[PDB]
């Protein structure tokens, strides 16, 4: 196999779906601190390089 367009067809919104689930019944601070990174990838804003 190989996966075509592997990076565009992800979504960090289902990364947040995973790390909300693989931190089941974990403490509140710990489930929170892993959760910021799929949040601020799901609002990320790429620059457009030089020009």
């Amino acid at each position: 196999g190989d996966n075509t367009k592997w990076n565009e067809n992800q979504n960090p919104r289902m990364f947040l779906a995973m790390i909300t689930y693989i931190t089941r019944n974990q403490p509140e601070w710990f489930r929170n601190v892993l959760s910021i990174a799929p949040i601020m990838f799901s609002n990320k804003m790429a620059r457009l390089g030089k020009g």
């Binding site: 509140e28 601070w29 929170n32």
Partner: protein
Amino acid sequence: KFLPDLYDYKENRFIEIGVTRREVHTYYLEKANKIKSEKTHIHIFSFTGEEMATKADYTLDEESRARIKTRLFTIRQEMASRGLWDSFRQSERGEETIEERF
């Protein structure tokens, strides 16, 4: 193994300071565990005016023992004359641990 508070050069015994608003025979055996087989001097100060040392031998002299326990009483009275004196103080001295409100 656990950190003392000060150190005297003459006696070469480490210094652990216990300040209480609770009765002193709480802290004489609360602070004594996990310390022993060592030469660490235990010496409890208090808001009230009482005091307890190791083997009832006071290293600190009379004028400075009477000065600190008065100032702790001045800490006790100004805490009492403020309007917020002892009840909320009782909770945190046993509850010091990892909280991490994130």
